[PDB]
């Protein structure tokens, strides 16, 4: 039982999963359905189909709380990074602007060693 007409959509799309969270413009979360929350598991969580399913779930759960328009912030080297936006669009929401907020260090912390697979 809330009512936030305008909100923000954060889409974190990694190589292993995707998480969509809907917040008010102040950073308080409304709904957050993710790829594992939708029925999926394992390596299927990285497929674009799972991403768009999670986007639909989150969009409708937020509409139930009263959101009509969301600004989009995407980050991560994922594959559902655009399919989630398309599902947010064609699940009853208008997005408008889209931002890229992938964190970029200024040559800071040492990364883990390269996989010898």
């Amino acid at each position: 039982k809330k009512n936030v007409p305008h909100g923000a959509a954060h889409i974190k799309s990694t190589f292993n999963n995707t998480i969509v969270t809907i917040t008010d413009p102040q950073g308080n979360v409304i709904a957050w359905a993710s790829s594992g929350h939708v029925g999926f598991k394992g390596s299927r969580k990285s497929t674009p189909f799972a991403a768009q399913l999670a986007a639909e779930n989150a969009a409708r759960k937020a509409q139930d709380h009263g959101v009509r328009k969301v600004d989009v912030f995407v980050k991560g080297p994922g594959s559902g990074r655009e399919t989630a936006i398309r599902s947010l669009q064609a699940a009853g929401l208008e997005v408008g602007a889209i931002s890229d907020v992938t964190p970029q260090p200024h040559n800071g912390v040492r990364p883990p060693k390269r996989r010898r697979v």
Partner: protein, 152 residues
Amino acid sequence: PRKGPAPKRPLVNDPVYGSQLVTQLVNKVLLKGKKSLAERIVYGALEQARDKTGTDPVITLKRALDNVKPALEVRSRRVGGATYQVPVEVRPDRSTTLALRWLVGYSRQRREKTMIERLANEILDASNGLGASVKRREDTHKMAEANRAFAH
């Protein structure tokens, strides 16, 4: 093959019922070159269908085929250390071929006495949406649905 597609052969209309659908049906039933026997079986099945339902037999057959024709198949593939099914669209002529194969194959193993009445019963049940031929289409669709993730 490797050098592109091959020419497919044409068929002629069935004399008693001016359709190629029943010609494909007799060619699916045909075994050991006994084409006259296959024609006899198909004609008897169509006549029993007509005498049991009143409706035109080829119309009943088209209804049954529309019931059993699939839309998505599940061709298998291997990617890494695992192999998984990939749902793909079915072209129309392959769909008709597969539906006819399903009808004849499932009627061959029905619990009845003669192939004529086995096939007639299978056609009627398919046109009504009850038979194992329809169950096969539904199972195929469910498996194509439960693997949409791998739609690369």
